[PDB]
Amino acid sequence: SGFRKMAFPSGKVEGCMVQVTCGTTTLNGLWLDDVVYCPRHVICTSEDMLNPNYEDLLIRKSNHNFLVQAGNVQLRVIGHSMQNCVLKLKVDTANPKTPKYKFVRIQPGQTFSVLACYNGSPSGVYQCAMRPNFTIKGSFLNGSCGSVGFNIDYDCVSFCYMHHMELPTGVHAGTDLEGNFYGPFVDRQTAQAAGTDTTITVNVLAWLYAAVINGDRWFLNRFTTTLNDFNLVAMKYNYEPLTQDHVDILGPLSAQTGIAVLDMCASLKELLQNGMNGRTILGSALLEDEFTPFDVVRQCSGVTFQ
């Protein structure tokens, strides 16, 4: 019993974190086999970041200018290339701690764990979600760039995020491990603002199921609804529209609890319309949307790794 915002165990990623220094700048890189991945803005100075021409700035760089350090041990850089917004530094030693791994580009609403690092050193782990506006709400200070987001399935780390930028509103933007930004964001210090931070409806529903499984059930009501009626209310509250795909993925939690997906939607509708009146659900006073259906099953089941 109990339901917690839970990150994946981070050891497998911890063994891949290194420090990358180019000139005056130091951030984190990810060492997988004989390649180190990091944000290409390592090559920029603070001034460069208003309008960088990365291809021109890169001309001035040679392998020996990228200082890569794994713990107290220096790695030899034998090649480098730019792929979209990441650098790939080829080193002469394969990381002996490389886990099984994959690079995934996730969809908005999907959750992942972040290992926050500074100077190649892990500082903490927490769970995040790719918001529908393609930001994440993280905890990143100067030097955390190159920290990564990831999921683990049995013994295989699926890397999905690399941290690059803090927007002036305090939210965060980054890339997949091929270096393509999530959303419209760019690695320049310019006027970029996040769109509407809509609520991830399927995740709220999943979390409500989690609550019922754990004895928080005061919000269950006598009502039901339809997809179209529920979405009229969702839209009004800046909730993502619920689709039949979404209903289907809630099927297993529906089956375990005996509460039809649309009956749960009617509970959510009343919560949106009447608030919580000072009550709590799973220790929260607002409706949590950073747990996916798979997350809820996983944690309510006890699936483990490696």
Residues in CB range of 87: below 8 A, 6 or more apart: 37, 38, 39, 40, 42, 43, 66, 80, 81
- Site track 95-134 with ligand CLU (rule: CB under 6 A), x = hit: xx-x------------------------------------
In the block, tokens 């689709």 appear at 243
Task: Judge whether 128 counts as a catalytic residue.
Answer: no
Residue from 23, 10, 24, 18 nearest 74 by CA = 18
Choose the catalytic residue: 16, 38, 41, 265. 41
Identify the CA nearest to 31 among candidates 48, 52, 13, 43. Answer: 13
* Between 101 and 209, CB nearer to ligand CLU: 101
Contact between 146 and 18 (Cβ < 8 Å): no
Distant-in-sequence, close-in-space partners of 11: CB < 8 Å, separation ≥ 6: none
**Structure-block tokens of residue 175:** 């890339």
Cα diameter, the chain = 69
Does residue 162 bind a second copy (CB under 8 A)? no
Phi, psi of 5 (to 5 degrees): -70, 105
By CB under 6 A, residue 94 contacts ligand CLU: yes
The window from 5-13, 70-78, 94-102, 259-267 that contacts ligand CLU (CB under 6 A) reads 94-102
Of 26, 110, 133, 144, the one binding a second copy by CB under 8 A: 144
156 binds ligand CLU (CB under 6 A): no
Residue 101 touching a second copy (CB under 8 A): no
Figure out which of the listed residues 33, 92, 155, 248 binds ligand CLU, where binding follows CB under 6 A. 33
| Other beta carbons within 10 Å of 81 | 11
Q: Which residue has the tokens 């009956």?
A: 263
**Least Å from the CB of residue 249 to a second copy:** 21
Q: Is 78 in the site for ligand CLU (CB under 6 A)?
A: no
Question: Which of 145, 164, 172, 265 is flagged as catalytic?
Answer: 145
Three-state SS string across 229-275, please?
HHHHHHHHCCECCCCHHHHHHCHHHHHHHCCCHHHHHHHHHHHHHHC
Least Å distance, CB 127 to ligand CLU, is 28
Q: Specify the DSSP class assigned to residue 284.
A: B
Q: Is residue 73 close enough to count as binding ligand CLU by CB under 6 A?
A: no
Q: Which of 5, 14, 15, 34 binds ligand CLU (CB under 6 A)?
A: 34
Q: Which of residues 279-298 bind a second copy (CB under 8 A)?
A: 280, 283-286
Q: Closest distance between ligand CLU and the C-beta of residue 300, in Å?
A: 35
Q: How far is CA 128 from the centre of its chain?
A: 5
CA-CA distance, 99 to 15, in Å (whole number)? 9
> Is residue 207 classed as helix, strand or coil in its secondary structure?
helix
> If binding is defined by CB under 6 A, does position 286 make contact with ligand CLU?
no
**Known active-site residue 41:** yes
Q: Is 218 in the site for a second copy (CB under 8 A)?
A: no
- Residue 94 contact partner, candidates ligand CLU, a second copy, none, CB within 5 to 8 A by sort of partner: ligand CLU
Nearer to ligand CLU, 41 or 88 (CB): 88
Residues that bind a second copy (CB under 8 A): 1-12, 14-15, 71, 115-119, 121-126, 137-144, 166, 170-172, 214-215, 275, 278, 280, 283-286, 299-306
Catalytic residues, by residue number, are: 41, 145
Name the site residues for ligand CLU (rule: CB under 6 A). 33-34, 94-96, 98
